[PDB]
Amino acid sequence: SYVPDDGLTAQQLFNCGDGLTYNDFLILPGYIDFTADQVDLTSALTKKITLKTPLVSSPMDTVTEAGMAIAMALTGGIGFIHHNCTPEFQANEVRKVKKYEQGFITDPVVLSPKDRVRDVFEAKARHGFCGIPITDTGRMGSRLVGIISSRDIDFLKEEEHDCFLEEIMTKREDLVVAPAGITLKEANEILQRSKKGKLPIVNEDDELVAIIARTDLKKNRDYPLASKDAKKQLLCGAAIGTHEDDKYRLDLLAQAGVDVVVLDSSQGNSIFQINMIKYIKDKYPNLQVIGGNVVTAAQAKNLIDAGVDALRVGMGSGSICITQEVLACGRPQATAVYKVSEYARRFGVPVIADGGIQNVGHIAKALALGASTVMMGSLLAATTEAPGEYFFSDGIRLKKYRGMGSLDAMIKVAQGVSGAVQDKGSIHKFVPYLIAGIQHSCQDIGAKSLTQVRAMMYSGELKFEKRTSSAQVEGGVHSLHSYEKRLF
Amino acid sequence: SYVPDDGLTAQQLFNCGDGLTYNDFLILPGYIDFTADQVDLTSALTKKITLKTPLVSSPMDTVTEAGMAIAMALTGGIGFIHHNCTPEFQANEVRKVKKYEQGFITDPVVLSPKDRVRDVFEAKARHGFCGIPITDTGRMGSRLVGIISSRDIDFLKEEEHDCFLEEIMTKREDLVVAPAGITLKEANEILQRSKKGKLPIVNEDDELVAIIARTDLKKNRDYPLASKDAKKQLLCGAAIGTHEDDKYRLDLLAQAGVDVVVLDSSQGNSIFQINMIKYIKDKYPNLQVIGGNVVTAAQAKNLIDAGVDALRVGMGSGSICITQEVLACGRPQATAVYKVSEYARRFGVPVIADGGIQNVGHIAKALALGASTVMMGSLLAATTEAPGEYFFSDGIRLKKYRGMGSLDAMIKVAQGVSGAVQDKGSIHKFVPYLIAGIQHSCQDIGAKSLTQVRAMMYSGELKFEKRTSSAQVEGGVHSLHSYEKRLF
Amino acid sequence: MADYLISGGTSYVP
Amino acid sequence: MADYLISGGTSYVP
Ligand SMILES: NC(=O)c1ccc[n+]([C@@H]2O[C@H](COP(=O)([O-])OP(=O)(O)OC[C@H]3O[C@@H](n4cnc5c(N)ncnc54)[C@H](O)[C@@H]3O)[C@@H](O)[C@H]2O)c1
Ligand SMILES: NC(=O)c1ccc[n+]([C@@H]2O[C@H](COP(=O)([O-])OP(=O)(O)OC[C@H]3O[C@@H](n4cnc5c(N)ncnc54)[C@H](O)[C@@H]3O)[C@@H](O)[C@H]2O)c1
Ligand SMILES: Nc1nc2c(ncn2[C@@H]2O[C@H](COP(=O)(O)OP(=O)(O)OP(=O)(O)O)[C@@H](O)[C@H]2O)c(=O)[nH]1
Ligand SMILES: Nc1nc2c(ncn2[C@@H]2O[C@H](COP(=O)(O)OP(=O)(O)OP(=O)(O)O)[C@@H](O)[C@H]2O)c(=O)[nH]1
Ligand SMILES: Nc1nc2c(ncn2[C@@H]2O[C@H](COP(=O)(O)OP(=O)(O)OP(=O)(O)O)[C@@H](O)[C@H]2O)c(=O)[nH]1
Ligand SMILES: Nc1nc2c(ncn2[C@@H]2O[C@H](COP(=O)(O)OP(=O)(O)OP(=O)(O)O)[C@@H](O)[C@H]2O)c(=O)[nH]1
Ligand SMILES: Nc1ncnc2c1ncn2[C@@H]1O[C@H](COP(=O)(O)OP(=O)(O)OP(=O)(O)O)[C@@H](O)[C@H]1O
Ligand SMILES: Nc1ncnc2c1ncn2[C@@H]1O[C@H](COP(=O)(O)OP(=O)(O)OP(=O)(O)O)[C@@H](O)[C@H]1O
Ligand SMILES: O=c1[nH]cnc2c1ncn2[C@@H]1O[C@H](COP(=O)(O)O)[C@@H](O)[C@H]1O
Ligand SMILES: O=c1[nH]cnc2c1ncn2[C@@H]1O[C@H](COP(=O)(O)O)[C@@H](O)[C@H]1O
C-alpha cells in the first residue's frame, strides 16, 4: 500500500479554474486483475430507473424516432423523442415504441367474427403485425373463439367475397390456452411445448385477458442487454418544452404511458418549468422526469430542491450549438459535468452529459469524470434509423443534421446551425463497438464497474493530468505522409 | 386522322450514315389514353423463354455472381454468369442459383437421427436454412422418420448433450404428405388448407421423392413477376470462352442444367464460334445459346444461319471498352442495334444490346430503337448485391470495376480498363425504379406494351429527330449554379 | 410466341 | 437499485 503519489486528482485540477474540455486532460491507468468484457455497464438515469448501458439518444429531429428509439432501447440504451410536431404525432410515435416488445400484453387487435378479411388487411397496414385473435363480440373482456395468423391470409386471390370470419379461421377446441393467474416462466414452458407462436390467456370463464407472441423470445435471445421495465414494456422517453400548451402534450402520452420525460430547454432554469414540475408531481407522482438544462451548481440546486430527480447537464457545447458564440453563456462542458456531479452526489440525482463528443474516448472520460449516463447526438446521427433519408454532396453519402436552436422552429434568433454528416450505418454494428471500447477503457484504467470508477474518483485514488495545446497535437495521428481513419 | 408526318422515321434517320449514339437523337411523343401502371412490359430474348422485364446483367467477372443472379432474376430479370476462373467454381455458383426457389424439391439435404443438434447447427451455418427432413438412412431415397423446422432448435443449451435426434422430433403419424405423381395446384392447396409449413412427398413405399415449403407462396406474391421456368425455378445463364477446354466448361453445367448460355467473344464472326455452335446444337437441341459480338448484318447473317437464337450486339460500346482506341473496330452502338435488329426481325431472332448506358433513358429508347432486350452492365455495377466490397478513396464509399478483357485477367495486348464507381444501393429498391422509368417512357410514347413500340417504329408511325452539340449540352441541367441529381 | 412478342403480324414487309 | 449505482456509500466529506 505504498502507491507513490505521482499524478493529480480531480479537485487538484478543477480549482485551477481553466476552461477544461474533454481533450484537455487525461486519465491515468491502474492495477487490474481481470478481463475486458468482464466489467459491466450498469448505470442509471433516475432515482429508480437504471440502465445496463449509458448510451442515450438526443431529443432532436435529426436523430430520434422509433428508429432510434427501438434501436437504442433494444440495444439496451434509451431514446427520447423531440417534441416539435403535433402532440398526436409523438402519441403515435410512442404507440409505436412501447409496443412491439410487450409481455403479458393487454387489449390487442381483436374483432367480431362477422367482419371481413380486408379489415385484417388494413389493420396490419396500420400495424405491421397479423397475429390477431377473435372473440365472440370484439371487446377484450369477451368470450374467446379463435385466432388468426399470417398463414391463413396469405394466399387469398379470392379476397373479399363477403368473407365472414367464422368458416375461415382456427376453431375453438384445437387451441391450447392458459388459465389466468400465471407468471412468465410457465407461459414460456407452454409456448415451447406448443411451438405455435401465440398463446392466449383466459380465465376459467373463457374470458380473454392476455395473449403472448413468440418473437418476444427471439428478440430476447438476440438482444440480451435489453433495457426492459417490470411489465416487459420497452423503455421510452420524450421531450417536452415549457410553453403552457404542453400540458395537453404530456397528458395524452401519459395515458399512453411514457415512463420518462425530459423538460428540454437551452437554459432550463426558469419559474416556468418549476411551476410545471409542481404541476406534474401532484398529477403524476409515480411518473419520473429528467430535468434540464443546467450548466452549474446554483440552478442545479434550485431545480433539484424544486423536486426534480434527474439532471440533464450541458449547454453551448454540442457539435452543433453556436450558443456560446451568440448567447455568450454556457461553459466548458467537462468542468460543467464535473461540478454538477459532485453537487449531484449530495442528493443522489443522476447526471447525463451533452454534446462535445468526438468519439468513444470522450464518453469514456465523461463517464469516468462522474456523469451518470451520456446522451449524444452526432455520431448517433447519420444512421439508417435516423429519420428522413439520405442524399449526396459530391457523391458523399450523408444525412443532414439540424438542431432546434437553428432557424427551424417551424422575429427570431438562431442558437445553432443546420449541417450534415456522412452515414455510419446501423447501430447494431456500431453501439457494440461503443460499449466494448468503453469497457476496454474501464478495464485499463483499473475498475470493475462504473460505480467503481466514480467512487474511485471521489476517493481521488485515480488521478488525472492536464495536457497542453501542443500536447494533444501528437495525441492524435501525426508524423507521416498519409493514413486511414477506421475504427472497427 | 389527319396527323402530319413531322419528324424522321428510323430508316430515313440512320441512312444518313452518321454514327448516332443515344446521346444525339431523341424520341418524339405521341397520343396517350391510359396510365403508366396499365402498361405491359413483357419482353423476350429467345424463341422460347420470355421475360417480364427487359433487362439483364452483363457477365463480367467483377459485376455478377450469385447475388446479382438470384436478386435480379427474382425481380423478373435474368442474370448471366462470367467465365473468369475454373469451371467447378462457376458450377458451384450456377448450382446455388439453380435453387433458391424450386418446384418439388428433388434432393435436398436430409439426415439420419444418430446425428446431433450441433450437426444441424453446422449444416445451417453453411446453408442458412434449417427446415430439415430426416430419414432412416440419411440418404434421399429413404424411409421417412420425421420433420424438423426452425421452431425446434432455437432454444436449447444442449447442442450435443446426448442430443441424438430421436427423442426430439415430431413423430410422423400426424404428418401429412402427398403421394407422388401430382401437380402443384392440389399440392399447394392441401398445403395451405393443411396449414403446417412444410409438405413432403413420398410414394406408397414411403420413399422420399419431394418436399415443398411455404416459401414458394411469399416469394410468389412478393415477386409477382419473377421469371419462373416450367418447374417454377428461376432462370439462369452463364458465359463461356472459346479455348478448347470450353467443352469441359459447358458439359458440367449442362449436368447442372443451366437454362441458357451466352457465347462471349471479342468479336463473333469466326469459324470457332459457328463450329462450337454446331458442337452445341447436336449435343443440346433443348438448350439455347445467344451470339456475339457482332455489330453489322454480315456477321449477323452468318451467325444466325448457324442456328443461334439470340444475339448480343455492340462492341466498342461499353463503359470500359477502349477497343476503338487500340483496335479500331466496332461502331456506335445505336447505329448498330437498329440495323442488326432490322436484320434480326427477318428471322424472329431477338437481340440484347450492350454498352454506354447512363440511365433509364438510354435503355428505354434503346429497346424502343428495335432491340428486344438490353444487357446493361455498369449502371447496376457496384450495388450491395455486387461481388467485391465497399471501400473508400477520397472519402467516398466505393467499389472497383474492371473490364473482362483487361490486362488484369491473369506477350499480349490489353483492351479493357479497371476502375470504380459509387454505390447504388439495393437492387430491389433500384430495378423497380428502372421498370418505373421504362413504363413512364413508354407511357409517354403511348403503347400498352413494348412489342407494339417496336412495331410502331416498324410502322414508322412515331418519328425521331436529330440532336446537335448544343442540344445535348442543353439536355441535362445548364445555366445553373449548383444542384443535386437524385434519381429517386 | 416470341415472334409475336417482338413485332407480330407484319414480320418483315421489305 | 439506482442510489448505490453512482458510488455506493461515500456521499460525504465536504
Ligand atoms: N447545448 C444545448 O443543449 C442546446 C444548445 C442550443 C440550443 N438548444 C435548444 O434550444 C431550444 C430552445 O428552447 P428554449 O430553451 O428557448 O425554451 P422555450 O423555447 O420553450 O422558451 C423560449 C424562450 O421563452 C422563455 N420561456 C421559457 N419558458 C417559457 C414559457 N412557458 N412561456 C413563455 N416563455 C418562456 C425563455 O426565455 C425561452 O428562451 C431548447 O429546446 C434547446 O433544446 C439546446
Ligand atoms: N464489348 C465486349 O463485349 C468485348 C469486346 C472486346 C473484347 N471483349 C472481351 O475481351 C476478352 C478477351 O479477349 P480475347 O479475344 O483474347 O478472348 P475471346 O474469347 O474474345 O477470343 C479468344 C482469342 O483467341 C483466339 N481464339 C478464337 N477462338 C479460339 C479458340 N477456340 N481457341 C483458342 N483461341 C481462340 C482469338 O485470337 C481470340 O482473340 C474476351 O473475354 C472478350 O469477351 C469484350
Ligand atoms: N397479433 C398481434 N401482434 C402484436 C401486437 N402488438 C405487438 N405485436 C407485435 O407483432 C410482433 C410480430 O408479430 P409476429 O410474432 O411475427 O406474428 P404476426 O403478427 O402474425 O406476423 P408474421 O411474422 O407475419 O406471422 C410481436 O413481436 C409483437 O410484439 C398485437 O396487439 N396483436
Ligand atoms: N421473451 C422475453 N422473456 C423475458 C424477458 N424478461 C425476462 N424474461 C424471462 O423472465 C425470466 C425470469 O427472469 P425475470 O426476473 O422474470 O426477468 P429478467 O431478470 O429480465 O430475466 P432475463 O431477461 O433472462 O435477464 C428470464 O429467464 C427470462 O427468460 C423479456 O423481456 N422477453
Ligand atoms: N428450409 C429449407 N429451405 C431449402 C431447402 N432446400 C432449398 N431451400 C431453399 O430455401 C428456401 C427457403 O428456405 P427456408 O425454409 O425459409 O429457411 P429455414 O430456416 O429452413 O425456414 P423454415 O423451413 O420455415 O424453418 C426454399 O424455398 C428453397 O428455395 C431445404 O432443404 N430446407
Ligand atoms: N402459388 C403458386 N402456383 C403455381 C406456381 N407455379 C405454377 N403454379 C400453378 O400452375 C398453374 C397453371 O398455371 P401456370 O401458367 O402453369 O403457372 P402460373 O399461373 O404462372 O403460377 P402462379 O405464379 O401462381 O401465377 C397456376 O394456376 C398456378 O397456380 C408457383 O410457383 N406458385
Ligand atoms: N393455441 C394455439 N393453438 C393452435 N394453434 C395455434 C395456437 N397458437 C398459434 N397457433 C397456430 O399457429 C398458426 C400460425 O402461428 P405461427 O407462429 O406458427 O406462424 P405465423 O405467425 O403465421 O408466421 P411466422 O411464424 O413466420 O411468424 C396460427 O394460425 C395458429 O393456427
Ligand atoms: N406434415 C407436418 N406435420 C406436422 N407438423 C408439421 C408438418 N410440416 C411442418 N410441420 C410442423 O409445423 C412446423 C413448421 O415450422 P415453420 O415453417 O413455421 O418454421 P419457421 O418459423 O417458419 O422458420 P423460419 O422463420 O426460419 O422460416 C414444424 O416445426 C413442424 O413442427
Ligand atoms: O437545438 C439545438 N441546437 C444546437 N444544439 C442542441 C440543440 N438542442 C440540443 N442540443 C444539444 O446539442 C448536442 C448535440 O451535439 P452532439 O451531441 O455533439 O452531437 C446535444 O448535447 C444536445 O442536447
Ligand atoms: O474488357 C472489355 N473490353 C471491351 N468491352 C468489354 C470489356 N468488358 C466488358 N465489355 C463489354 O462492356 C459491356 C458493359 O457495358 P457498360 O454497362 O457500358 O459497362 C459488357 O456487356 C461487355 O460486352
Q: How many Å apart are CA A130 and CA A153, to the nearest integer?
A: 9
Q: How far apart are CA B190 and CA B200, in angstroms?
A: 12
Environment class of B358 (CB within 10 Å of its CB; exposed 0-12, middle 13-18, buried 19+): middle
Subunit contact A44:D11, Cβ cutoff 8 A: no
Residue A407 and residue A61: Cα distance in Å, rounded? 13
CB contact under 8 A, C2 and B345: no
Is A388 annotated to bind a ligand? Reply is no
Q: Which residue has the cell 374467446?
A: A144
Q: What value, to the nearest 5°, has the Cα angle with vertex A94 and ends A90 and A98?
A: 170
Cell 443522489 sits on residue: A348
Per DSSP, B233 falls in state: P
Region of A378 on the Ramachandran plot (φ > 0 left; ψ -120 to 50 alpha; else beta):
alpha
CA atoms within 13 A on the CB side of B413: 7
Residues of A in contact with B218 (CB under 8 A): 154
Contacting residues for A424 by C-beta, under 8 A, at least 6 apart: A379, A382, A383, A430
Which grid cell is B290? 445467344
- Sign, CA dihedral A240-A243-A247-A248, equals negative
* Min Cα separation B86/chain C (Å): 35
Buried b (16+ CB within 10 A) or exposed e, B295-317: bbbebbbebbebebbbbbbbbbb
| Grid coordinates belonging to A313 | 447537464
On whether A315 is known to bind a ligand per the annotation, the reply is yes
Q: Which residue has the cell 470462352?
A: B241
The dihedrals phi and psi of B297, each to the nearest 5 degrees, come to: -80, -20
Question: For residues A107 and A160, is the Cβ–Cβ distance under 8 A?
Answer: no
Q: How far apart are CA A288 and CA A280, in angstroms?
A: 10
Among candidates A151, A393, A397 on the partner chain, residue whose Cβ is nearest the Cβ of B397: A397
Q: Which ligand is nearest to the CA of A381?
A: 9
The verdict on a CB contact (< 8 Å) between B423 and A397 is yes
3-state helix, strand, coil in chain B (%, to 5): 35, 15, 50
Strand partners, A234: A228
Cβ of residue B350 closer than 8 Å to a chain C Cβ? yes
Q: Whose CA is nearest to atom 19 of ligand 5?
A: B129
Distances from the Cα of A144 to the Cαs of A140, A186, A213, A392, B331, in angstroms? Answer: 9, 21, 17, 54, 74
Residues B449/B40, Cβ–Cβ less than 8 Å: yes
CB within 8 Å of B92: residues ≥ 6 apart: none
From B327, B249, B257, select the one nearest B287 (Cα to Cα).
B257
Instruction: Look up residue B14 and give its three cell numbers.
Output: 440512320
Partner-chain residue, chosen from C2, C6, C12, that has the shortest CB–CB distance to B454: C6
Length of chain B: 488
Query: Cell numbers of A87, please?
Result: 402532440
Please give, rounded to a whole number of angstroms, the shortest distance from the CA of C3 to a CA of chain B: 5
Handedness of CA B291, B296, B300, B302 (dihedral sign): negative
With both helix axes pointing from N to C terminus, report the angle between A333-344 and A360-368 in degrees, rounded to the nearest 10.
30
How far CA A72 is from CA of A54, A67, A236, in Å, comes to 10, 8, 10
Q: State yes or no: is B85 an active-site residue.
A: no
Contact A186, B229 (CB under 8 A): no
Q: In 3D, which of A105, A36, A49 has the Cα closest to residue A77?
A: A49
Burial A366-398, CB ≥16 within 10 A → b, else e: bbbbbbbbbbbbbbbbbbebbeeebeeeeebbb
Query: Is B264 known to sit in a ligand binding site?
Result: yes
Alpha helices in A257-389 (DSSP H): 271-283, 297-306, 323-326, 333-344, 360-368
Asked if residue A466 has its Cβ within 6 Å of ligand 7, the reply is: no
B152 with A195: Cβ contact below 8 A: yes
CA angle B95, B98, B102 (to 5 degrees): 135
Structural biology method used: cryo-EM
Q: CB neighbours of C6 closer than 8 A, spacing ≥ 6?
A: B44, B345, B348, B350, B372, B451, B454
Among B350, B458, B459, the residue with its CB nearest the CB of C2 is B350
Distance CA A66, CA A75 (A): 13
Q: Which segments of A321-416 are extended strands (E)?
A: 351-354, 373-375, 391-393, 396-402
Beta strands of A195-254 (E only): which ranges? Answer: 199-202, 208-212, 239-240
Q: Alpha helices of B355-450 — where are they, by DSSP H?
A: 360-368, 431-445
CA of B196 to the centre of ligand 6 (A): 21
Amino acid B327 reads L
Say if strands A132-135 and A144-148 run parallel, antiparallel, or are unpaired. antiparallel
Alpha helices, DSSP H, located in B184-327: 184-194, 215-222, 246-256, 271-283, 297-304, 323-327
The helix (H) or strand (E) run that includes residue B95 is: helix B87-98
Quoted resolution (Å): 4.2
Catalytic residue among A16, A321, A329, A442: A321
Contact between B111 and B138 (Cβ < 8 Å): yes
Contact: C2, B455; criterion CB under 8 Å: no
Q: Is B403 in the pocket of ligand 10 (CB under 6 A)?
A: yes
**Rounded-to-integer distance, Cα B110 and Cα A435, Å:** 42
Please count the residues of chain C.
14
Chain B to chain C Cβ contacts (< 8 Å): 41
Q: Residue B346: phi, psi to the nearest 5?
A: -70, -25
The whole-angstrom distance between B393's CA and the closest CA on chain A is: 10
DSSP H or E stretch at residue A376: none
Residue owning the nearest CA to atom 11 of ligand 4? A185
CA atoms within 13 A on the CB side of B461: 14
For residue B222, the 8-state DSSP code is H
Query: How much distance in Å is there from the Cα of B56 to the middle of ligand 10?
Result: 13
Percent helix, strand and coil across chain C, each to the nearest 5: 35, 0, 65
Distance from C-alpha of D2 to C-alpha of A451, rounded to nearest angstrom: 10
In this structure, chain D runs to a length of: 14
Helices (H), A47-167: 66-74, 87-97, 117-127
Query: Is the distance from CB of B414 to CB of B405 less than 8 angstroms?
Result: yes
